[PDB]
Enzyme design. Structure first.
Site, PDB file in Angstrom:
ATOM      1  CG  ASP A 207      -1.617   1.142   1.333  1.00 22.85           C
ATOM      2  OD1 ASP A 207      -2.056   2.184   0.303  1.00 22.85           O
ATOM      3  OD2 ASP A 207      -1.745   1.686   2.495  1.00 22.85           O
TER       4      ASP A 207
ATOM      5  CD  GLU B 216      -5.701  -0.348  -1.954  1.00 20.68           C
ATOM      6  OE1 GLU B 216      -4.817  -0.717  -1.264  1.00 20.68           O
ATOM      7  OE2 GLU B 216      -6.865  -0.040  -2.021  1.00 20.68           O
TER       8      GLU B 216
ATOM      9  CD  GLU C 124     -11.680  10.527  -5.863  1.00 19.08           C
ATOM     10  OE1 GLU C 124     -11.154   9.379  -5.540  1.00 19.08           O
ATOM     11  OE2 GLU C 124     -11.294  11.695  -5.325  1.00 19.08           O
TER      12      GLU C 124
ATOM     13  CG  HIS D 255      -5.472  32.608  -2.596  1.00 20.80           C
ATOM     14  ND1 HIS D 255      -4.276  33.091  -2.692  1.00 20.80           N
ATOM     15  CD2 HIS D 255      -5.946  31.857  -3.499  1.00 20.80           C
ATOM     16  CE1 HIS D 255      -3.706  32.653  -3.763  1.00 20.80           C
ATOM     17  NE2 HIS D 255      -4.754  32.040  -4.246  1.00 20.80           N
TER      18      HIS D 255
ATOM     19  CG  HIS E   1       0.188   2.491   6.802  1.00 25.37           C
ATOM     20  ND1 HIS E   1       0.857   3.389   7.869  1.00 25.37           N
ATOM     21  CD2 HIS E   1      -0.423   3.549   5.852  1.00 25.37           C
ATOM     22  CE1 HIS E   1       0.110   4.550   7.520  1.00 25.37           C
ATOM     23  NE2 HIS E   1      -0.643   4.849   6.477  1.00 25.37           N
TER      24      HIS E   1
ATOM     25  CG  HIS F 114     -18.881  13.169  30.787  1.00 28.21           C
ATOM     26  ND1 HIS F 114     -17.632  13.693  31.386  1.00 28.21           N
ATOM     27  CD2 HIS F 114     -19.775  14.283  30.591  1.00 28.21           C
ATOM     28  CE1 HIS F 114     -17.743  15.026  31.374  1.00 28.21           C
ATOM     29  NE2 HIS F 114     -18.811  15.384  30.830  1.00 28.21           N
TER      30      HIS F 114
ATOM     31  CG  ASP G 229     -17.571  18.504  30.068  1.00 30.34           C
ATOM     32  OD1 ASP G 229     -16.833  17.535  29.981  1.00 30.34           O
ATOM     33  OD2 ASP G 229     -18.289  18.997  31.058  1.00 30.34           O
TER      34      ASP G 229
END
Length: 1171
Positions: A10, A643, A647, A721, A864, A1100, A1131
């Site tokens: 990868d 790999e 898109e 910009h 990975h 919590h 929080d």
DNA sequence: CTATGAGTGGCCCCTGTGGAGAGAAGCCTGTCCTGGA
DNA sequence: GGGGCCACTCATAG
RNA sequence: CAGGACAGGCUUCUCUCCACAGGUUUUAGAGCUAGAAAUAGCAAGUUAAAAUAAGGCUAGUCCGUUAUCAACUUGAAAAAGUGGCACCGAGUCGGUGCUU
């Protein structure tokens, strides 16, 4: 017996995964031999792992800094030239004057003469500074008066002028009035008469600033006594003291004074000025960026004209002074280097030193331009010994059209099979229709050539559907210019017109384009020459003149262009011509394929296109695969590697956004209904340029401020910009917007102010309705309402990294295919033991999703190698028990997670400059400036570290003490340390050096400690977390599902089953919290933060599941590899724990890790350092 | 009586634009072509 | 994001 | 299956060079009055010079933040070489056997 195995990888910007599996989807396990003097002799490791590394840096910062050095050096050289031209005259009145000027920054003790620079005595210095409050007063008095003055005064004046000469953006009856309006925009005052109105405007600003300061002082003391000292005495606050004596800016001062004038009566005129940004304004402001240098030139001319009667040398050298103020290095000549620099290409007519007074004579400008343009031209893929031709060349466009016409087969009446157009047919068609029309469709040809000339009323055409896209654009332009069709049709002018087009495409300037064509002045009239000079052409092609028309086929004596014009019944196109064995063209192509010296893998990888990071990654990848094939037993695998993912989007939306940019802006203007379109002609080639495109988007109204746009002002307008530059790197158009220069220069790393957003939101909404602006562009305006820049906004994936992780397909492909196979068969066809398999991320992603192998990046760095292993197994599968085996494989904790070690390089320290302090940690700016008197840099970066064992003298008794401590080597001292460590250590103060004990320790040198706890040496006094948490797959899946409790994508049944699993396993949260606590108490040792987190968790317990899961994800930052990072838990906010202790690793064990960590040499310090 | 390592918290990071050219990569439309299986 | 430096406090050798 | 160029359109980025404004730091720009001093009150507040990675020798209006880099042996460097396997299990890898 050579087992059959595969490899999976990868590839990312910062990661390189590697994994080796057998045929049965199982990674083999191997026990290796370890080097060193330690107890352990044999250790066993699995054949999976990943290599983490830093991101490669683009060269933009380096290039900007280099340009900055050249800019500074040339500025100082101009100053030196001016000093030389005044030195002979100035020494007559004062020899030490320049000595005082060059030595101002020193302290009085270090100064040789008195501290007062200009006059040398306090009386005249005070007289100067009272007569002339600012230098512009001196400028005005000299320019308007007619009295002889002191040479020091004019020296200071002209020195100020030359140093800040101004911009060159502007080049070269009613024009005088337009110039007056330009100055009126530039200069706030108009009525006062003078030859240097800039001084008048700025003195006007000075006087009004003084008067308003007096009024504010009087009124504030009259009404509000308590805030008087804060405004005029408190430098720390954001008042007037901060505005002048502090670091506050103009906008900050206005923001702070607005409430003061609001609470105060009589502030009418003050509020009016504040709303106009014209109140209490300084001398040096950000508004001077629009000042043309022509005003400075005119003022210099006036002052030299007035002062020339007093000093002969001024009028003798005034042309030289004007040259210095006006000279500029041509943008195409490049650096003036005499061979030694690798960036230079300038050609030398002689060997003399280049000066601004002889630059024209000494350097061949035409050869320089030719060299500059030729450097970046692509070479022909078939003939590496030839250059490509301009895209506007007549021969190239003939190639295009004839190639288009080559495959125009026509169907008529009385025929059976479609017939190629004849060469006579092609020539007649061109001469009758293309030489008369810029754009031609199939209807035009059918109705004008076959029906009218060939008398073929009904003809059908194959190979052309819509129209003949190519055009005789250059030919038609030349027809309009010259108006001699016979000259164009003459083939003896082919070379003449070819060089004409070449010259029109090479040189952008006007003098050169006029000069080289001067030889051809005997051909056409002066007006044709002038119009040709006005014509311009840009671009280059992918083919060569030699291929098309230079070389001739031996048996026929015909050129490729001649073949295209008439190829007979065959009528081959360019591709068949180059691929036809019947012609020697293919033989010439094969012979011209030079077998140059085999480029080193570094050279082959570096000569590619893309960021340095991607080639760093590919080099790491090939090194890893080489090491794996070496260790395994030098037997090649069968199925491996990449790999690579995209898109692809939907074709329809991409096409519709691509089509009709010009008509899209036209429809936008029509929707708004503004009369702008009829006022100014529109052209698609003009819409190609960015500036006019932005101008038409604005629809005549600036986004930031209410203003009426101008065509000429577009040069002065500057694109800014809306998203800040340093906070996020973006050059996308939707970020970019046109605005007036003052607005651009006003805010740096700042979002637009809220009030401007409020006042302009209506117009921005109208633009959004007009659809001229994208939603994101509107959001950048809205970012002010969001609260400005924020941490979460910066934490966005950069598109360049994605571009590269799409970009590294093919390069890996050919490098693997090349080093993989270096031998051929008898037929010379290449035989491959391994086949490169390429797969997209979608396949493995659905493989993970359908089979519950989810993905959370922030758990640990095991992902990975896991993705590499999955890539391997899926690649093998495409070409039950297997899934269970994969499940076991992804479960071992023993994974060779190793980070490569680097020698840190780059900046010496932080760029900021700190005021002097009584400390020893400051860095001298030069070899002689003690930071005590002058301050300097701070926080220098360390290059690497060594472990030093020696004797040191401790205490006032100077008693020697044998010690063993590590001292960090900075980048400031890398050369000195590598040059002679012994002398450096002697000078530092270490005696009796044991040279054998010096160990080269770069960054991230991992040190192993008790209980399996590990630490990487972050720096000479800092450490980073070295261990990783081995989270079981069950907890990974449960945590991912809990985080995705409400956003699962799928059928209701699977989602409901996952929800039931999440709710039934609620006790997993306690288990993972206790696991984190145990891991902390073992290797993190963060008792205070651990107690804080546990207390917050107990507080919590009843929180909703999603918020709890998000907070748990936030918790792993504490347990993640690398440096600690701040994070928020519900929080509660938890601070970071910084390990500033370096006493402990002096007794631990070093482990040097191979590139994949399979071969290591453990070294024990507890045995080292013996006495 | 005093100096100095060791622990904790809080704090700080240079910026902006114009001009000129070339290249690469990606997406789409059309053209055709080339080698294979 | 992530490492360097100072204010504050404190034990220990001299 | 894959590649190519053609011409058009769109988007993004890279690479190389030439200019302009600031910013930061040190000093100069007599601070005065009451008071021994702390302190108190008052006056003034815009500007200038220098530096902007330490520096280097090839001495140029040239270069200095890109790239490369586990350990040992050999080589100045580039570069070359140097390190067992099969089976059973698993909490940072361990357990059994053969030969070296």
């Amino acid at each position: 017996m050579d087992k059959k195995y595969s490899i999976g990888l990868d590839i990312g910007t910062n990661s390189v995964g590697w994994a080796v599996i057998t045929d049965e989807y199982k990674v083999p396990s191997k026990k290796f031999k370890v080097l060193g003097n330690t107890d352990r002799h044999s250790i066993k490791k699995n054949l999976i792992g990943a290599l983490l590394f830093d991101s490669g840096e683009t060269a933009e910062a380096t290039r900007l800094k280099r340009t900055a050095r050249r800019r500074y050096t040339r500025r100082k050289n101009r100053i030196c030239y001016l000093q030389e031209i005044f030195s002979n005259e100035m020494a007559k009145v004062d020899d030490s004057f320049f000595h005082r000027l060059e030595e101002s920054f020193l302290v009085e003790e270090d100064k040789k003469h008195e501290r007062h620079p200009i006059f040398g005595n306090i009386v005249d210095e005070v007289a100067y500074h009272e007569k002339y409050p600012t230098i512009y007063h001196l400028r005005k008095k000299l320019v308007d008066s007619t009295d002889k003055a002191d040479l020091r005064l004019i020296y200071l004046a002209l020195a100020h002028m030359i140093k800040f000469r101004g911009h060159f953006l502007i080049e070269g009856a009613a024009k005088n009035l337009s110039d007056a309006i330009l100055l009126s925009d530039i200069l706030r005052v108009n009525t006062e008469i003078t030859k240097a109105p800039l001084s008048a405007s700025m003195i006007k600003r000075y006087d009004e600033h003084h008067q308003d300061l007096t009024l504010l002082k009087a009124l504030v003391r009259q009404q509000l006594p308590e805030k008087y000292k804060e405004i005029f005495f408190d430098q720390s606050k954001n008042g007037y003291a901060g505005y002048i004596d502090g670091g506050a800016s103009q906008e900050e001062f206005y923001k702070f004074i607005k409430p003061i004038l609001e609470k105060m009566d009589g502030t009418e005129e003050l509020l009016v000025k504040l709303n106009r940004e014209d109140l209490l304004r300084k001398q040096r402001t950000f508004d001077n960026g629009s000042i043309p240098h022509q005003i400075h030139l005119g003022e210099l001319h006036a002052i030299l004209r007035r002062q020339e009667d007093f000093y002969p040398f001024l009028k003798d050298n005034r042309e030289k002074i004007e040259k210095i103020l006006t000279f500029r290095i041509p943008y195409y000549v490049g650096p003036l280097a005499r061979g030694n620099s690798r960036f230079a290409w300038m050609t030398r007519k002689s060997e003399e030193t280049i000066t601004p007074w002889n630059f024209e004579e000494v350097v061949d400008k035409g050869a320089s331009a030719q060299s500059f343009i030729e450097r970046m031209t692509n070479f022909d893929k078939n003939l590496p010994n030839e250059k490509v031709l301009p895209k506007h060349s007549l021969l190239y466009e003939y190639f295009t059209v004839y190639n288009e016409l080559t495959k125009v087969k026509y169907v008529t009446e009385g025929m059976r099979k479609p017939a190629f157009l004849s060469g006579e047919q092609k020539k007649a068609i061109v001469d009758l229709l293309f030489k008369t029309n810029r754009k031609v469709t199939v209807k035009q040809l059918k109705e004008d050539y076959f029906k009218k000339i060939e008398c073929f009323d009904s003809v059908e055409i194959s190979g052309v559907e819509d129209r003949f896209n190519a055009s005789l654009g250059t030919y038609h332009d030349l027809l309009k210019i010259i108006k001699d069709k016979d000259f164009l049709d003459n083939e003896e002018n082919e070379d003449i017109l070819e060089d004409i087009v070449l010259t029109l495409t090479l040189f952008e300037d006007r003098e050169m384009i006029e000069e080289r064509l001067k030889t051809y002045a005997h051909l056409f009239d002066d007006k044709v020459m002038k119009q040709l000079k006005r014509r311009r052409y840009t671009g280059w092609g992918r083919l060569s003149r030699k291929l098309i028309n230079g070389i001739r086929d031996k048996q026929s004596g015909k050129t490729i262009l001649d073949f295209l014009k008439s190829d007979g019944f065959a009528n081959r196109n360019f591709m068949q011509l180059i691929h036809d064995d019947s012609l020697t063209f293919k033989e010439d192509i094969q012979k011209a394929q030079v077998s140059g010296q085999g480029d080193s893998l570094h050279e082959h990888i570096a000569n590619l296109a893309g960021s340095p990071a991607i080639k760093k990654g590919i080099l790491q990848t090939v090194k890893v695969v080489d090491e794996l094939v070496k260790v395994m037993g030098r037997h090649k695998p069968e199925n491996i590697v990449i790999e690579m993912a995209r898109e692809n989007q939907t074709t329809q939306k991409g096409q519709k956004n691509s089509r009709e940019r010009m008509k899209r802006i036209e429809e936008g203007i029509k929707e708004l209904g503004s009369q702008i379109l009829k006022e100014h002609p529109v052209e698609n080639t003009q819409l190609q340029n960015e500036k006019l495109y932005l101008y038409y988007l604005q629809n005549g109204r600036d986004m930031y401020v209410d203003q009426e746009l101008d065509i000429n002002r577009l040069s002065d307008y500057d694109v800014d910009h809306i998203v800040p530059q340093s906070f996020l790197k973006d050059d996308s158009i939707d970020n970019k917007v046109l605005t007036r220069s003052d607005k651009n220069r006003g805010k740096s790393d700042n979002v637009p102010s809220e009030e401007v957003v409020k006042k302009m939101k209506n117009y921005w909404r109208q633009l959004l309705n007009a659809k001229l602006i994208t939603q994101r562009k509107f959001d950048n305006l809205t970012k002010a309402e969001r609260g400005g820049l924020s941490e979460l906004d910066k934490a966005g994936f950069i598109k360049r990294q994605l571009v590269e992780t799409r970009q590294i397909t093919k390069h890996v492909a050919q490098i693997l295919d090349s080093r993989m196979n270096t031998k051929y068969d008898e037929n010379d066809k290449l035989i491959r033991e391994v086949k490169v398999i390429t797969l997209k991320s979608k396949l493995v992603s659905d493989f993970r999703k359908d089979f519950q192998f989810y993905k959370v990046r922030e758990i640990n760095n095991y992902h990975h190698a896991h993705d590499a292993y999955l890539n391997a197994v899926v690649g093998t599968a495409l070409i039950g028990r297997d899934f269970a085996t994969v499940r076991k494989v992804l479960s071992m904790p023993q994974v060779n997670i190793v980070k490569k070690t680097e020698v840190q390089t780059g900046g010496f320290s932080k760029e900021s400059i700190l005021p002097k302090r009584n400390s020893d940690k400051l860095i001298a700016r030069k070899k002689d400036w003690d930071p005590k008197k002058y301050g300097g840099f701070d926080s220098p970066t360390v290059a690497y570290s060594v472990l030093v064992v020696a004797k040191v003298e401790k205490g006032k008794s100077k008693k020697l003490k044998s010690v063993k401590e590590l001292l960090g080597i900075t980048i400031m001292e890398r050369s000195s340390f590598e040059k002679n460590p012994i002398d450096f250590l002697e000078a530092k103060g270490y005696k009796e050096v044991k040279k054998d004990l010096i160990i080269k320790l770069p960054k991230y040198s991992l040190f192993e400690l008790e209980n399996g706890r590990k630490r990487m040496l972050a720096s000479a006094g800092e450490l980073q977390k070295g261990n990783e948490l081995a989270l079981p797959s069950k907890y990974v899946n449960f945590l991912y599902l809990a985080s995705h409790y409400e956003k699962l994508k799928g059928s209701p049944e699977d989602n409901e089953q996952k929800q039931l699993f999440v709710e039934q396993h609620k006790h997993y949260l306690d288990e993972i919290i206790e696991q984190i606590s145990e891991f902390s108490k073992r290797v993190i040792l963060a008792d205070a933060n651990l107690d804080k987190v546990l207390s917050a968790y107990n507080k919590h317990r009843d929180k909703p599941i999603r918020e709890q899961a998000e907070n748990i994800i936030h918790l792993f930052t504490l347990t993640n590899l690398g440096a600690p990072a701040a994070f928020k838990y519900f929080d509660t906010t938890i601070d970071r724990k910084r390990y500033t202790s370096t006493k402990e690793v002096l007794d631990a064990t070093l482990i040097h890790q191979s590139i994949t960590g399979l071969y290591e040499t453990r070294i024990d310090l507890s045995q080292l350092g013996g006495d």
